[PDB]
Protein backbone atom coordinates (compact mmCIF):
# COMPACT_ATOMS: atom_id res chain seq x y z
CA UNK A 1 0.00 0.00 0.00
CA UNK A 2 2.71 2.46 -1.03
CA UNK A 3 4.97 3.62 -3.86
CA UNK A 4 6.75 0.40 -4.83
CA UNK A 5 10.21 1.89 -5.36
CA UNK A 6 12.52 -0.51 -7.20
CA UNK A 7 16.29 -0.06 -7.45
CA UNK A 8 18.26 -2.52 -9.56
CA UNK A 9 22.05 -2.33 -9.48
CA UNK A 10 23.79 -2.87 -12.82
CA UNK A 11 27.52 -3.56 -12.55
CA UNK A 12 29.65 -4.51 -15.53
CA UNK A 13 28.21 -7.28 -17.72
CA UNK A 14 27.01 -9.18 -14.65
CA UNK A 15 24.59 -6.31 -14.02
CA UNK A 16 21.67 -8.63 -15.03
CA UNK A 17 21.44 -9.89 -11.45
CA UNK A 18 18.16 -11.39 -12.67
CA UNK A 19 19.33 -13.26 -15.74
CA UNK A 20 19.66 -11.67 -19.18
CA UNK A 21 20.91 -8.07 -19.63
CA UNK A 22 18.29 -5.44 -20.45
CA UNK A 23 20.72 -2.56 -20.98
CA UNK A 24 23.44 -4.62 -22.66
CA UNK A 25 21.79 -3.34 -25.83
CA UNK A 26 22.95 0.20 -25.05
CA UNK A 27 26.48 -1.16 -24.71
CA UNK A 28 26.23 -2.78 -28.13
CA UNK A 29 23.79 -0.38 -29.79
CA UNK A 30 26.79 0.92 -31.72
CA UNK A 31 29.94 -0.99 -30.74
CA UNK A 32 29.98 0.91 -27.46
CA UNK A 33 32.29 -1.37 -25.48
CA UNK A 34 32.29 -4.39 -23.17
CA UNK A 35 34.46 -3.34 -20.23
CA UNK A 36 34.32 -4.65 -16.66
CA UNK A 37 33.87 -1.08 -15.45
CA UNK A 38 30.48 -0.36 -17.00
CA UNK A 39 28.07 0.80 -14.29
CA UNK A 40 24.34 1.43 -14.64
CA UNK A 41 21.41 2.00 -12.28
CA UNK A 42 17.71 1.81 -13.11
CA UNK A 43 14.90 2.92 -10.79
CA UNK A 44 11.16 2.61 -11.35
CA UNK A 45 8.18 4.13 -9.53
CA UNK A 46 4.80 3.02 -10.85
CA UNK A 47 5.51 5.50 -13.63
CA UNK A 48 2.61 4.25 -15.73
CA UNK A 49 4.68 1.30 -16.93
CA UNK A 50 8.42 1.99 -17.02
CA UNK A 51 11.34 3.56 -15.15
CA UNK A 52 14.37 5.83 -15.47
CA UNK A 53 17.61 4.35 -16.80
CA UNK A 54 20.66 6.37 -15.76
CA UNK A 55 24.33 5.95 -16.69
CA UNK A 56 26.67 5.81 -13.70
CA UNK A 57 29.79 7.37 -15.23
CA UNK A 58 31.92 7.56 -12.09
CA UNK A 59 30.60 6.59 -8.65
CA UNK A 60 32.85 7.17 -5.64
CA UNK A 61 31.06 7.17 -2.28
CA UNK A 62 29.75 10.56 -1.18
CA UNK A 63 26.26 11.83 -0.36
CA UNK A 64 26.76 14.15 -3.32
CA UNK A 65 26.21 11.17 -5.62
CA UNK A 66 23.77 9.44 -3.28
CA UNK A 67 21.48 12.47 -3.17
CA UNK A 68 21.55 12.93 -6.94
CA UNK A 69 20.24 9.42 -7.61
CA UNK A 70 17.59 9.28 -4.88
CA UNK A 71 16.51 12.60 -6.40
CA UNK A 72 15.91 11.12 -9.86
CA UNK A 73 14.41 8.03 -8.25
CA UNK A 74 11.28 9.19 -6.43
CA UNK A 75 11.97 12.89 -5.89
CA UNK A 76 11.48 15.95 -8.09
CA UNK A 77 10.30 15.01 -11.58
CA UNK A 78 12.32 16.04 -14.64
CA UNK A 79 10.54 17.40 -17.72
CA UNK A 80 13.44 19.09 -19.50
CA UNK A 81 16.23 16.53 -19.11
CA UNK A 82 18.20 19.55 -17.93
CA UNK A 83 20.14 17.53 -15.35
CA UNK A 84 21.40 15.26 -18.13
CA UNK A 85 22.56 18.37 -19.98
CA UNK A 86 24.41 19.54 -16.89
CA UNK A 87 25.85 16.16 -15.93
CA UNK A 88 25.08 13.79 -18.80
Amino acid sequence: LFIATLKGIFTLKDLPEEFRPFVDYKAGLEKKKLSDDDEIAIISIKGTQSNHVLFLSSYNSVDEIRKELEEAGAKINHTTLKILEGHL
Side-chain angles (χ1 to χ4, degrees):
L1 343 159
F2 301 111
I3 295 58
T5 27
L6 239 39
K7 289 162 116 156
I9 295 189
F10 290 146
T11 86
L12 328 326
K13 296 315 101 65
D14 217 12
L15 45 80
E17 86 104 353
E18 243 209 310
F19 259 101
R20 307 251 277 168
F22 209 102
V23 306
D24 164 295
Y25 85 98
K26 171 189 220 164
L29 89 94
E30 192 193 80
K31 90 233 240 38
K32 225 224 137 122
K33 254 295 292 193
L34 280 51
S35 263
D36 271 27
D37 240 346
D38 223 337
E39 260 198 337
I40 314 198
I42 298 194
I43 329 168
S44 84
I45 27 138
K46 205 247 256 165
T48 331
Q49 255 155 208
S50 236
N51 72 53
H52 339 301
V53 70
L54 277 192
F55 193 46
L56 306 179
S57 248
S58 239
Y59 213 86
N60 290 45
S61 16
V62 312
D63 269 357
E64 197 157 297
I65 41 164
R66 201 163 145 278
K67 245 162 158 221
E68 208 137 87
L69 223 61
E70 226 163 275
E71 250 169 82
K75 226 227 243 265
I76 302 184
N77 48 9
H78 341 84
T79 180
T80 177
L81 296 108
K82 259 267 220 220
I83 57 189
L84 261 94
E85 213 119 313
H87 81 95
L88 207 328

Coordinates of all heavy atoms in Angstrom, one line a residue:
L1 N 0.8 -1.2 0.0 CA 0.0 0.0 0.0 C 0.9 1.3 0.0 O 0.7 2.2 0.8 CB -0.9 0.0 1.2 CG -1.0 -1.4 1.9 CD1 -1.5 -1.2 3.3 CD2 -2.0 -2.3 1.1
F2 N 1.8 1.3 -0.9 CA 2.7 2.5 -1.0 C 3.3 2.5 -2.4 O 2.9 1.8 -3.3 CB 3.8 2.4 0.0 CG 3.3 2.3 1.4 CD1 3.4 1.2 2.2 CD2 2.7 3.5 2.0 CE1 2.9 1.1 3.5 CE2 2.2 3.4 3.3 CZ 2.3 2.3 4.0
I3 N 4.3 3.4 -2.6 CA 5.0 3.6 -3.9 C 6.1 2.6 -4.0 O 7.2 2.9 -3.7 CB 5.5 5.0 -4.0 CG1 4.4 6.1 -4.0 CG2 6.4 5.1 -5.3 CD1 3.5 6.0 -2.8
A4 N 5.8 1.5 -4.6 CA 6.8 0.4 -4.8 C 8.0 0.9 -5.6 O 8.0 1.0 -6.8 CB 6.1 -0.7 -5.6
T5 N 9.0 1.3 -4.8 CA 10.2 1.9 -5.4 C 11.2 0.8 -5.6 O 11.7 0.2 -4.6 CB 10.8 3.0 -4.4 OG1 10.4 2.7 -3.1 CG2 10.4 4.4 -4.8
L6 N 11.6 0.5 -6.9 CA 12.5 -0.5 -7.2 C 13.9 0.1 -7.6 O 13.9 1.1 -8.2 CB 12.0 -1.4 -8.4 CG 11.9 -2.9 -8.1 CD1 11.4 -3.1 -6.6 CD2 11.0 -3.5 -9.1
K7 N 14.9 -0.5 -7.2 CA 16.3 -0.1 -7.4 C 17.2 -1.2 -7.8 O 17.8 -1.9 -6.9 CB 16.9 0.7 -6.3 CG 16.2 2.0 -6.0 CD 16.4 2.6 -4.6 CE 17.2 3.8 -4.6 NZ 17.0 4.6 -3.4
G8 N 17.4 -1.4 -9.1 CA 18.3 -2.5 -9.6 C 19.7 -2.0 -9.9 O 19.9 -1.1 -10.6
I9 N 20.7 -2.7 -9.3 CA 22.1 -2.3 -9.5 C 22.6 -3.1 -10.7 O 22.5 -4.3 -10.8 CB 22.9 -2.7 -8.2 CG1 22.5 -1.8 -7.1 CG2 24.4 -2.4 -8.6 CD1 23.4 -1.9 -5.9
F10 N 23.2 -2.3 -11.6 CA 23.8 -2.9 -12.8 C 25.3 -2.6 -12.9 O 25.7 -1.5 -13.2 CB 23.1 -2.3 -14.1 CG 21.7 -2.7 -14.3 CD1 20.8 -1.9 -14.8 CD2 21.3 -4.0 -13.9 CE1 19.5 -2.3 -15.0 CE2 20.0 -4.4 -14.1 CZ 19.1 -3.5 -14.6
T11 N 26.1 -3.7 -12.5 CA 27.5 -3.6 -12.6 C 28.1 -4.4 -13.6 O 27.8 -5.6 -13.7 CB 28.1 -4.0 -11.2 OG1 28.3 -5.4 -11.1 CG2 27.2 -3.5 -10.0
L12 N 29.0 -3.8 -14.4 CA 29.6 -4.5 -15.5 C 28.6 -5.3 -16.3 O 27.5 -4.9 -16.5 CB 30.7 -5.4 -15.0 CG 31.4 -4.9 -13.7 CD1 31.5 -3.4 -13.7 CD2 30.7 -5.4 -12.5
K13 N 29.1 -6.4 -16.9 CA 28.2 -7.3 -17.7 C 27.3 -8.2 -16.8 O 26.3 -8.6 -17.3 CB 29.0 -8.2 -18.6 CG 29.8 -7.4 -19.7 CD 29.0 -6.3 -20.3 CE 29.3 -4.9 -19.7 NZ 30.7 -4.5 -20.0
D14 N 27.8 -8.4 -15.6 CA 27.0 -9.2 -14.6 C 25.9 -8.4 -14.0 O 25.2 -8.9 -13.1 CB 27.9 -9.7 -13.5 CG 27.6 -11.1 -13.1 OD1 26.8 -11.8 -13.8 OD2 28.1 -11.6 -12.1
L15 N 25.7 -7.2 -14.5 CA 24.6 -6.3 -14.0 C 23.2 -7.0 -14.0 O 22.4 -6.7 -13.2 CB 24.5 -5.0 -14.8 CG 24.6 -5.1 -16.3 CD1 23.3 -5.6 -16.9 CD2 25.0 -3.8 -17.0
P16 N 23.0 -7.9 -15.0 CA 21.7 -8.6 -15.0 C 21.5 -9.6 -13.9 O 21.3 -10.8 -14.1 CB 21.7 -9.4 -16.4 CG 22.9 -8.8 -17.1 CD 23.8 -8.4 -16.1
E17 N 21.6 -9.1 -12.7 CA 21.4 -9.9 -11.5 C 20.3 -10.9 -11.6 O 20.3 -12.0 -11.0 CB 21.2 -9.0 -10.2 CG 19.7 -8.6 -10.0 CD 19.1 -9.4 -8.9 OE1 19.7 -10.3 -8.4 OE2 17.9 -9.1 -8.5
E18 N 19.3 -10.5 -12.4 CA 18.2 -11.4 -12.7 C 18.5 -12.6 -13.6 O 18.5 -13.7 -13.1 CB 17.0 -10.6 -13.3 CG 15.8 -10.5 -12.4 CD 14.5 -10.4 -13.3 OE1 14.5 -9.5 -14.2 OE2 13.5 -11.2 -13.0
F19 N 18.9 -12.2 -14.8 CA 19.3 -13.3 -15.7 C 20.0 -12.6 -17.0 O 21.2 -12.4 -17.0 CB 18.1 -14.1 -16.2 CG 18.0 -15.4 -15.5 CD1 17.2 -15.6 -14.4 CD2 18.8 -16.5 -15.9 CE1 17.1 -16.9 -13.8 CE2 18.7 -17.7 -15.3 CZ 17.9 -17.9 -14.3
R20 N 19.2 -12.3 -18.0 CA 19.7 -11.7 -19.2 C 19.7 -10.2 -19.0 O 18.9 -9.5 -18.3 CB 18.7 -12.0 -20.4 CG 18.5 -13.5 -20.5 CD 19.2 -14.1 -21.8 NE 18.5 -13.9 -23.0 CZ 18.9 -14.0 -24.2 NH1 20.2 -14.4 -24.4 NH2 18.2 -13.8 -25.3
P21 N 20.7 -9.5 -19.7 CA 20.9 -8.1 -19.6 C 19.8 -7.3 -20.4 O 19.5 -7.7 -21.5 CB 22.3 -7.9 -20.3 CG 22.4 -9.0 -21.2 CD 21.7 -10.2 -20.5
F22 N 19.3 -6.3 -19.8 CA 18.3 -5.4 -20.4 C 18.9 -4.2 -21.0 O 18.4 -3.6 -22.0 CB 17.2 -5.1 -19.4 CG 15.9 -4.9 -20.1 CD1 14.9 -5.8 -20.0 CD2 15.6 -3.7 -20.7 CE1 13.6 -5.7 -20.5 CE2 14.3 -3.5 -21.3 CZ 13.4 -4.5 -21.2
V23 N 20.0 -3.8 -20.5 CA 20.7 -2.6 -21.0 C 21.9 -2.9 -21.9 O 22.3 -2.1 -22.8 CB 21.3 -1.7 -19.8 CG1 20.2 -1.4 -18.8 CG2 22.4 -2.5 -19.2
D24 N 22.3 -4.2 -21.8 CA 23.4 -4.6 -22.7 C 23.3 -4.1 -24.1 O 24.3 -3.8 -24.8 CB 23.5 -6.2 -22.7 CG 24.3 -6.7 -23.8 OD1 23.9 -6.5 -25.0 OD2 25.3 -7.3 -23.6
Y25 N 22.1 -3.9 -24.5 CA 21.8 -3.3 -25.8 C 22.4 -2.0 -26.0 O 23.0 -1.7 -27.1 CB 20.3 -3.2 -26.1 CG 19.7 -2.0 -25.5 CD1 19.4 -0.9 -26.4 CD2 19.3 -1.8 -24.2 CE1 18.9 0.3 -25.9 CE2 18.8 -0.7 -23.7 CZ 18.6 0.4 -24.6 OH 18.0 1.6 -24.1
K26 N 22.4 -1.1 -25.0 CA 22.9 0.2 -25.0 C 24.5 0.1 -25.2 O 25.1 1.0 -25.8 CB 22.6 1.0 -23.8 CG 23.3 2.3 -23.7 CD 23.1 3.0 -22.3 CE 22.9 4.5 -22.4 NZ 22.3 5.1 -21.2
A27 N 25.0 -1.0 -24.6 CA 26.5 -1.2 -24.7 C 26.9 -1.7 -26.1 O 28.1 -1.6 -26.5 CB 26.9 -2.1 -23.6
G28 N 25.9 -2.3 -26.8 CA 26.2 -2.8 -28.1 C 25.4 -2.2 -29.2 O 25.3 -2.6 -30.3
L29 N 24.7 -1.1 -28.8 CA 23.8 -0.4 -29.8 C 24.6 0.3 -30.9 O 24.0 0.8 -31.8 CB 22.9 0.6 -29.0 CG 23.5 2.0 -28.9 CD1 23.1 2.9 -30.0 CD2 23.2 2.6 -27.6
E30 N 25.9 0.3 -30.7 CA 26.8 0.9 -31.7 C 28.3 0.7 -31.4 O 29.1 1.6 -31.4 CB 26.5 2.4 -31.8 CG 27.2 3.1 -33.0 CD 27.2 4.6 -32.9 OE1 28.0 5.2 -32.1 OE2 26.3 5.3 -33.5
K31 N 28.6 -0.6 -31.1 CA 29.9 -1.0 -30.7 C 30.5 -0.1 -29.6 O 31.6 0.3 -29.6 CB 30.9 -0.9 -32.0 CG 31.5 0.5 -32.2 CD 31.3 1.0 -33.5 CE 32.6 1.2 -34.3 NZ 33.6 0.2 -34.0
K32 N 29.6 0.1 -28.6 CA 30.0 0.9 -27.5 C 31.3 0.4 -26.8 O 32.3 1.0 -26.9 CB 28.8 0.9 -26.4 CG 28.6 2.3 -25.9 CD 28.4 2.2 -24.4 CE 29.1 3.4 -23.7 NZ 28.1 4.2 -22.8
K33 N 31.1 -0.8 -26.1 CA 32.3 -1.4 -25.5 C 31.8 -2.3 -24.4 O 30.8 -2.1 -23.8 CB 33.2 -0.3 -24.9 CG 34.5 -0.1 -25.7 CD 35.4 -1.3 -25.6 CE 35.9 -1.6 -24.2 NZ 37.0 -2.6 -24.2
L34 N 32.6 -3.4 -24.2 CA 32.3 -4.4 -23.2 C 33.4 -4.5 -22.1 O 34.1 -5.4 -22.0 CB 32.1 -5.8 -23.8 CG 30.8 -6.0 -24.5 CD1 30.4 -4.9 -25.4 CD2 30.7 -7.3 -25.2
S35 N 33.5 -3.4 -21.3 CA 34.5 -3.3 -20.2 C 33.9 -3.8 -18.9 O 32.7 -3.8 -18.7 CB 35.0 -1.9 -20.1 OG 36.2 -1.8 -20.8
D36 N 34.8 -4.2 -18.0 CA 34.3 -4.7 -16.7 C 34.1 -3.5 -15.7 O 34.0 -3.7 -14.5 CB 35.3 -5.6 -16.1 CG 35.1 -7.1 -16.5 OD1 34.4 -7.3 -17.6 OD2 35.5 -8.0 -15.7
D37 N 34.1 -2.3 -16.3 CA 33.9 -1.1 -15.4 C 32.5 -0.5 -15.6 O 31.9 0.1 -14.7 CB 34.9 0.0 -15.8 CG 35.8 0.4 -14.7 OD1 35.4 0.1 -13.5 OD2 36.8 1.1 -14.9
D38 N 31.8 -0.8 -16.7 CA 30.5 -0.4 -17.0 C 29.6 -0.4 -15.7 O 29.6 -1.4 -15.0 CB 29.8 -1.2 -18.1 CG 29.1 -0.4 -19.1 OD1 28.7 0.7 -18.8 OD2 28.9 -0.9 -20.2
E39 N 28.9 0.7 -15.5 CA 28.1 0.8 -14.3 C 26.8 1.5 -14.6 O 26.8 2.7 -15.1 CB 28.8 1.5 -13.2 CG 29.4 0.6 -12.1 CD 29.7 1.3 -10.8 OE1 29.9 2.5 -10.9 OE2 29.8 0.6 -9.8
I40 N 25.7 0.9 -14.4 CA 24.3 1.4 -14.6 C 23.4 1.2 -13.5 O 23.6 0.3 -12.6 CB 23.7 0.8 -15.9 CG1 24.7 0.8 -17.0 CG2 22.5 1.6 -16.3 CD1 24.1 0.6 -18.4
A41 N 22.4 2.1 -13.4 CA 21.4 2.0 -12.3 C 20.0 2.4 -12.7 O 19.8 3.6 -13.1 CB 21.9 2.9 -11.1
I42 N 19.1 1.5 -12.7 CA 17.7 1.8 -13.1 C 16.8 1.8 -11.9 O 16.8 1.0 -11.0 CB 17.2 0.8 -14.1 CG1 18.1 0.9 -15.4 CG2 15.7 1.0 -14.5 CD1 17.4 0.1 -16.6
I43 N 15.9 2.8 -11.9 CA 14.9 2.9 -10.8 C 13.5 3.2 -11.3 O 13.3 4.2 -12.1 CB 15.3 4.0 -9.8 CG1 16.8 4.1 -9.7 CG2 14.8 3.7 -8.4 CD1 17.3 5.4 -9.0
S44 N 12.5 2.4 -10.9 CA 11.2 2.6 -11.4 C 10.3 3.1 -10.2 O 10.7 3.0 -9.0 CB 10.6 1.3 -11.9 OG 10.1 0.5 -10.9
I45 N 9.1 3.6 -10.5 CA 8.2 4.1 -9.5 C 6.8 4.2 -10.1 O 6.2 5.3 -10.3 CB 8.6 5.5 -9.0 CG1 9.4 6.3 -10.1 CG2 9.4 5.4 -7.7 CD1 9.0 7.7 -10.2
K46 N 6.2 3.1 -10.3 CA 4.8 3.0 -10.9 C 4.6 4.1 -11.9 O 3.5 4.7 -12.0 CB 3.8 3.1 -9.7 CG 2.4 2.5 -10.0 CD 1.3 3.6 -10.1 CE 0.5 3.6 -8.9 NZ -0.4 4.8 -8.8
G47 N 5.6 4.5 -12.6 CA 5.5 5.5 -13.6 C 4.7 5.1 -14.8 O 5.3 5.0 -16.0
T48 N 3.5 4.7 -14.6 CA 2.6 4.2 -15.7 C 3.0 2.8 -16.1 O 2.1 1.9 -16.2 CB 2.7 5.2 -16.9 OG1 3.1 6.5 -16.5 CG2 1.5 5.3 -17.8
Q49 N 4.2 2.6 -16.5 CA 4.7 1.3 -16.9 C 6.1 1.4 -17.5 O 6.4 1.0 -18.6 CB 3.8 0.7 -18.0 CG 2.8 -0.4 -17.5 CD 1.6 -0.5 -18.3 OE1 0.5 -0.9 -17.8 NE2 1.7 -0.1 -19.6
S50 N 7.0 1.9 -16.6 CA 8.4 2.0 -17.0 C 9.3 2.5 -15.9 O 8.9 2.4 -14.7 CB 8.6 2.9 -18.2 OG 9.2 2.3 -19.3
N51 N 10.4 3.0 -16.2 CA 11.3 3.6 -15.2 C 12.3 4.6 -15.8 O 12.1 5.1 -16.9 CB 12.1 2.4 -14.5 CG 13.2 1.8 -15.4 OD1 14.0 2.5 -16.0 ND2 13.1 0.5 -15.6
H52 N 13.4 4.9 -15.0 CA 14.4 5.8 -15.5 C 15.8 5.2 -15.5 O 16.3 4.9 -14.4 CB 14.4 7.1 -14.6 CG 13.1 7.3 -13.8 ND1 11.9 7.4 -14.4 CD2 12.9 7.4 -12.5 CE1 10.9 7.6 -13.5 NE2 11.5 7.5 -12.3
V53 N 16.3 5.0 -16.7 CA 17.6 4.3 -16.8 C 18.7 5.4 -16.8 O 18.8 6.2 -17.8 CB 17.7 3.5 -18.1 CG1 17.7 4.4 -19.3 CG2 19.0 2.6 -18.0
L54 N 19.6 5.4 -15.8 CA 20.7 6.4 -15.8 C 22.0 5.7 -16.0 O 22.1 4.5 -15.8 CB 20.7 7.1 -14.4 CG 19.7 8.2 -14.3 CD1 20.0 9.0 -13.0 CD2 19.8 9.1 -15.5
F55 N 23.0 6.5 -16.4 CA 24.3 5.9 -16.7 C 25.3 6.4 -15.6 O 25.7 7.6 -15.6 CB 24.8 6.4 -18.1 CG 26.0 5.6 -18.6 CD1 26.1 4.3 -18.4 CD2 27.1 6.3 -19.1 CE1 27.2 3.6 -18.9 CE2 28.2 5.6 -19.6 CZ 28.3 4.3 -19.5
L56 N 25.7 5.5 -14.8 CA 26.7 5.8 -13.7 C 28.1 5.9 -14.3 O 28.8 4.9 -14.3 CB 26.6 4.7 -12.6 CG 25.2 4.5 -12.0 CD1 25.3 3.4 -11.0 CD2 24.6 5.7 -11.4
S57 N 28.5 7.1 -14.7 CA 29.8 7.4 -15.2 C 30.9 7.0 -14.2 O 31.6 6.1 -14.4 CB 29.9 8.8 -15.7 OG 30.0 8.9 -17.1
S58 N 30.9 7.8 -13.1 CA 31.9 7.6 -12.1 C 31.3 7.7 -10.7 O 30.9 8.8 -10.3 CB 33.1 8.5 -12.2 OG 34.3 7.8 -12.4
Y59 N 31.2 6.6 -10.0 CA 30.6 6.6 -8.7 C 31.7 6.3 -7.6 O 32.3 5.3 -7.6 CB 29.5 5.5 -8.6 CG 28.4 5.9 -7.6 CD1 27.3 6.7 -8.1 CD2 28.4 5.5 -6.3 CE1 26.3 7.1 -7.2 CE2 27.3 5.9 -5.4 CZ 26.3 6.6 -5.9 OH 25.3 7.0 -5.1
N60 N 31.9 7.3 -6.7 CA 32.8 7.2 -5.6 C 32.2 6.6 -4.4 O 32.2 5.4 -4.1 CB 33.5 8.5 -5.4 CG 34.4 9.0 -6.5 OD1 34.0 8.9 -7.7 ND2 35.6 9.4 -6.2
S61 N 31.7 7.5 -3.5 CA 31.1 7.2 -2.3 C 30.8 8.4 -1.4 O 31.3 8.5 -0.3 CB 31.9 6.1 -1.5 OG 33.2 6.1 -2.1
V62 N 30.1 9.3 -1.9 CA 29.7 10.6 -1.2 C 28.3 11.0 -1.4 O 27.8 10.9 -2.5 CB 30.7 11.7 -1.6 CG1 32.1 11.3 -1.6 CG2 30.2 12.3 -3.0
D63 N 27.7 11.4 -0.3 CA 26.3 11.8 -0.4 C 26.0 12.6 -1.7 O 24.9 12.4 -2.3 CB 25.9 12.7 0.8 CG 25.4 11.9 2.0 OD1 25.3 10.7 1.9 OD2 25.2 12.6 3.1
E64 N 26.9 13.4 -2.1 CA 26.8 14.2 -3.3 C 26.2 13.3 -4.4 O 25.2 13.7 -5.1 CB 28.1 14.7 -3.8 CG 28.0 15.8 -4.8 CD 29.2 16.7 -4.8 OE1 29.5 17.4 -3.8 OE2 29.9 16.8 -5.9
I65 N 26.7 12.1 -4.6 CA 26.2 11.2 -5.6 C 25.0 10.4 -5.1 O 24.1 10.2 -5.9 CB 27.3 10.1 -6.0 CG1 28.0 9.6 -4.7 CG2 28.3 10.7 -7.0 CD1 28.8 8.4 -5.0
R66 N 24.9 10.1 -3.9 CA 23.8 9.4 -3.3 C 22.5 10.3 -3.4 O 21.4 9.8 -3.8 CB 24.0 9.1 -1.8 CG 23.2 8.0 -1.3 CD 23.7 7.4 0.0 NE 22.7 7.0 0.9 CZ 22.1 7.8 1.8 NH1 22.4 9.1 1.8 NH2 21.1 7.4 2.6
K67 N 22.6 11.6 -3.1 CA 21.5 12.5 -3.2 C 21.0 12.6 -4.6 O 19.8 12.5 -4.9 CB 21.9 13.9 -2.6 CG 21.1 14.2 -1.4 CD 21.8 15.4 -0.6 CE 20.9 16.1 0.3 NZ 21.1 17.6 0.2
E68 N 21.9 12.8 -5.5 CA 21.5 12.9 -6.9 C 20.6 11.8 -7.4 O 19.5 12.1 -7.8 CB 22.8 12.9 -7.8 CG 22.7 13.7 -9.1 CD 23.9 14.5 -9.4 OE1 24.8 14.0 -10.0 OE2 23.9 15.7 -9.0
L69 N 21.0 10.6 -7.2 CA 20.2 9.4 -7.6 C 18.9 9.5 -6.9 O 17.9 9.7 -7.6 CB 20.9 8.1 -7.2 CG 20.9 7.0 -8.3 CD1 21.6 7.5 -9.6 CD2 21.5 5.7 -7.7
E70 N 18.8 9.3 -5.6 CA 17.6 9.3 -4.9 C 16.7 10.4 -5.4 O 15.4 10.3 -5.3 CB 17.9 9.5 -3.4 CG 17.1 8.5 -2.5 CD 17.7 8.5 -1.1 OE1 18.6 7.7 -0.9 OE2 17.2 9.2 -0.2
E71 N 17.3 11.5 -5.9 CA 16.5 12.6 -6.4 C 15.8 12.2 -7.7 O 14.6 12.5 -7.9 CB 17.4 13.8 -6.7 CG 17.2 14.9 -5.7 CD 18.3 16.0 -5.8 OE1 18.2 16.9 -6.7 OE2 19.2 16.0 -5.0
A72 N 16.5 11.5 -8.6 CA 15.9 11.1 -9.9 C 15.2 9.8 -9.7 O 14.9 9.1 -10.7 CB 17.0 11.1 -10.9
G73 N 15.0 9.3 -8.5 CA 14.4 8.0 -8.2 C 12.9 8.2 -7.9 O 12.1 7.6 -8.5
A74 N 12.7 9.0 -6.9 CA 11.3 9.2 -6.4 C 11.1 10.6 -6.0 O 10.1 11.0 -5.3 CB 10.9 8.2 -5.3
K75 N 12.0 11.5 -6.3 CA 12.0 12.9 -5.9 C 11.5 13.8 -7.0 O 10.8 13.3 -7.9 CB 13.3 13.4 -5.4 CG 13.3 14.2 -4.1 CD 14.1 15.5 -4.2 CE 15.3 15.5 -3.2 NZ 14.9 16.2 -2.0
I76 N 11.9 15.0 -7.0 CA 11.5 16.0 -8.1 C 11.5 15.3 -9.4 O 12.3 14.4 -9.8 CB 12.4 17.2 -8.2 CG1 12.5 17.9 -6.8 CG2 12.0 18.1 -9.3 CD1 13.3 19.2 -6.8
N77 N 10.5 15.6 -10.3 CA 10.3 15.0 -11.6 C 10.9 15.9 -12.6 O 10.7 17.1 -12.6 CB 8.8 14.8 -11.9 CG 8.0 16.0 -11.6 OD1 8.5 17.1 -11.3 ND2 6.7 15.8 -11.6
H78 N 11.7 15.3 -13.6 CA 12.3 16.0 -14.6 C 11.4 16.1 -15.9 O 10.9 15.1 -16.3 CB 13.7 15.4 -15.0 CG 14.2 14.5 -13.9 ND1 13.8 13.2 -13.7 CD2 15.1 14.8 -12.9 CE1 14.5 12.7 -12.7 NE2 15.2 13.6 -12.2
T79 N 11.3 17.2 -16.5 CA 10.5 17.4 -17.7 C 11.3 18.2 -18.8 O 10.7 18.6 -19.8 CB 9.2 18.1 -17.4 OG1 8.4 18.3 -18.5 CG2 9.4 19.5 -16.8
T80 N 12.6 18.4 -18.6 CA 13.4 19.1 -19.5 C 14.8 18.5 -19.6 O 15.7 19.0 -20.2 CB 13.6 20.6 -19.1 OG1 14.4 21.3 -19.9 CG2 14.1 20.7 -17.7
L81 N 15.0 17.2 -19.1 CA 16.2 16.5 -19.1 C 17.4 17.5 -18.9 O 18.5 17.3 -19.4 CB 16.4 15.8 -20.4 CG 15.3 14.7 -20.7 CD1 14.3 15.1 -21.7 CD2 16.0 13.4 -21.1
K82 N 17.2 18.6 -18.2 CA 18.2 19.6 -17.9 C 19.4 18.9 -17.2 O 20.5 19.1 -17.6 CB 17.6 20.7 -17.1 CG 17.3 21.9 -17.9 CD 18.5 22.9 -18.0 CE 18.0 24.4 -17.9 NZ 18.8 25.3 -18.8
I83 N 19.1 18.2 -16.1 CA 20.1 17.5 -15.4 C 21.1 16.8 -16.3 O 22.3 16.9 -16.1 CB 19.5 16.5 -14.3 CG1 18.7 15.5 -15.1 CG2 18.7 17.3 -13.3 CD1 17.9 14.6 -14.1
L84 N 20.6 16.0 -17.2 CA 21.4 15.3 -18.1 C 22.3 16.2 -18.9 O 23.4 15.8 -19.3 CB 20.5 14.4 -19.1 CG 20.4 13.0 -18.7 CD1 19.1 12.8 -17.8 CD2 20.3 12.1 -19.9
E85 N 21.8 17.4 -19.2 CA 22.6 18.4 -20.0 C 23.6 19.0 -19.1 O 24.6 19.6 -19.6 CB 21.6 19.4 -20.5 CG 22.1 20.0 -21.9 CD 21.0 19.7 -23.0 OE1 20.5 18.6 -23.1 OE2 20.7 20.7 -23.7
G86 N 23.4 19.0 -17.8 CA 24.4 19.5 -16.9 C 25.4 18.5 -16.3 O 26.5 18.9 -15.9
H87 N 25.0 17.2 -16.4 CA 25.8 16.2 -15.9 C 25.6 14.9 -16.7 O 25.5 13.8 -16.1 CB 25.6 16.0 -14.4 CG 24.4 15.2 -14.1 ND1 24.5 13.8 -13.9 CD2 23.1 15.5 -14.0 CE1 23.2 13.4 -13.6 NE2 22.4 14.4 -13.6
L88 N 25.4 15.0 -18.0 CA 25.1 13.8 -18.8 C 25.2 14.1 -20.3 O 24.1 14.0 -21.0 CB 23.7 13.2 -18.5 CG 23.5 11.7 -18.7 CD1 24.4 11.3 -19.9 CD2 23.9 10.9 -17.5

